């Protein structure tokens with residue numbers, strides 16, 4: 001009874017904004033209660049309605065829907081086995097929102113998604129996204145790829161390199177420093193797994209880009225403020241690498 005009521009309320013279009021936020025928070029509540037029988041009967045219906053709600057014109061509804069999505073990912077990760085590409089694609093797409101709150105909520109959902117999704121399957125969908133998507137969806141995809149690369153074996157990673165590498169080499173040439181930095185950090189993660197077997201894949205990198213990558217590899221080996229500091233430091237170090 002309750003679930004049908006919540007779904008009907010959330011099916012309302014362009015009206016009843018506060019009542020729909022209550023319905024989303026009731027879904028969040030059921031998720032925090034576990035409500036295992038609700039998911040046994042209604043997982044598909046709830047997930048698909050939630051993903052539609054990502055397209056709502058109200059930013060506070062989009063952000064809240066992403067918070068609910070994150071909770072369902074945390075509590076019911078196994079059921080996403082059959083919705084992997086859909087959930088990755090919708091979550092990445094939300095990163096291009098004009099409203100910072102929606103982007104932040106998409107980032108938080110993406111962080112959780114990266115730890116549950118089958119890693120090889122995730123890497124495979126991210127590769128063409130990284131090569132084709134607009135900024136900052138490409139950025140989000142590279143950051144997700146880094147997290148899933150951290151979850152595969154050397155043997156698996158070596159098999160996936162021919163698909164992974166072109167996007168990282170391309171992204172290292174992007175005009176956005178955030179994308180270049182994300183690519184450097186992804187390459188550091190790849191190197192952490194396969195070591196100097198990365199070498200032949202890097203032949204297209206210029207001297208300055210190799211120097212900068214080497215600097216960050218050495219840092220990883222030797223050891224809000226920290227993040228912002230790191231982002232600016234990357235720009236200064238990159239500047240120095242090109243002189």
Ligand SMILES: [Cl-]
Nearest residue numbers: 076077078079
């Ligand atoms: Cl399950």
